[PDB]
Amino acid sequence: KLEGTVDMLNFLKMVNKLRCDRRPIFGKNLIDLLTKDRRVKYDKSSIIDNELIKPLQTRVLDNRKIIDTFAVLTPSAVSLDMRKLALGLNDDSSVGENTRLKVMQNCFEVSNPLHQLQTKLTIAFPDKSLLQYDCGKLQKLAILL
Amino acid sequence: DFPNAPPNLKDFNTNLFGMKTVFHSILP
């Protein structure tokens, strides 16, 4: 028993030494120091830049009408299993079960603003204008009225 | 409150603005 515990203590010593030898090339403190935004605060931040600068997300959000109006085409052919097979999230993939479930949960919780484009390009659902347009006679009636 | 009743005064001011041990540890 004493010989076994001596060997165990030696192995633990070596493992601890190897674990404490880990060092970074650049510390995260160094990363922050070289990345810190000088002394700029919100006290002197320009408010006008919130309207002058509009990211891609707010541009997608604000232009809803054009996206709704002009997204017309739909894919000619699709295969549903490729959606999950491409990412390796299928039940018989090489990705681990726990990691796969974690990725699925993160995807479920994440928010995407481009959903409207997806749903418009998925099914070419006609809108309430077609009842004006589907019947030429209704068109003539509209103009005459 | 819905039956046109005022709320508690301290609760009113708190909503306008917005002892025992639980964990002890020592090395043996």
């Binding site: 120091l33 | 639980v22 002890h24």
Partner: protein
């Protein structure tokens, strides 16, 4: 990128830390919670009172007794350095996170400043994207925006004016300069003249040969404008 690699920036960072082995933690919670904490070193012991945010950080780090931890009094961040040797016997197999370290010596609160040597190219890569420090090894950094480089020059000047950063210029050695093109030389003509340009040494073996990218022969394969600003050994 090669030119900026030849200039180094020696930047000083001042760090204030408290490190020691936590002896006892007692937390009382109803209202907000209050508690007292004791941290000892090899030659000191002190009882501290903990605020709500400090207690929240302690809980979110899941610190226990006998652990050596470091707290930055500026931000309150809590880092678990490791465990004491006395707790090593308690298990047969150890997790990756566990570490055995000795108890720090001296005063509980210490001030330390550290000097860092970082090249200008490294600073630009770090400050360009959100994960540039990986590109510092991968090399897939891309063409950094010029406005970024100007801002970095301004920042380095600001640090030097405040006296917290020092410039250590170096030597750029180009082997077989005749393998460059005429466009590269034309860029070098102006680029040699920047205030942050390093000292460039150039070694060539070809004599009167034809410059790459041109249709004429040259005394050493380099345009006369560049030789004008070059002394030949």
């Amino acid at each position: 990128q090669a030119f900026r690699k030849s200039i180094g920036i020696k930047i000083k960072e001042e760090t204030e830390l408290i490190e020691g082995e936590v002896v006892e933690i007692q937390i009382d919670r109803s209202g907000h919670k209050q508690g007292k904490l004791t941290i000892k070193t090899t030659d000191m012991e002190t009882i501290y009172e903990l605020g709500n945010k400090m207690i929240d950080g302690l809980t979110k780090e899941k610190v226990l007794a006998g652990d050596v931890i470091s707290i930055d009094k500026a931000s309150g961040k809590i880092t678990k350095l490791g465990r004491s040797f006395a707790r090593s016997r308690d298990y047969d197999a150890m997790g990756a996170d566990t570490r055995f370290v000795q108890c720090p010596e001296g005063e509980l609160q210490k001030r330390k400043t550290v000097v860092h040597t970082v090249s200008l190219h490294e600073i630009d890569v770090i400050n360009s994207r959100t994960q540039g420090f990986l590109a510092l090894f991968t090399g897939d950094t891309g063409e950094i925006r010029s406005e970024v480089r100007d801002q970095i020059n301004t920042k380095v000047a600001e640090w030097k004016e405040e006296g917290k950063a020092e410039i250590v210029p170096g030597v750029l050695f180009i082997d077989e300069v005749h393998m460059l093109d005429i466009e590269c030389f034309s860029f070098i003509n102006r680029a040699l003249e920047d205030e942050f340009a390093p000292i460039v040494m150039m070694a060539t073996n070809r004599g009167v040969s034809k410059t790459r990218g041109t249709n004429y022969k040259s005394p050493h394969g380099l345009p006369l404008d560049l030789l004008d600003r070059s002394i030949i050994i």
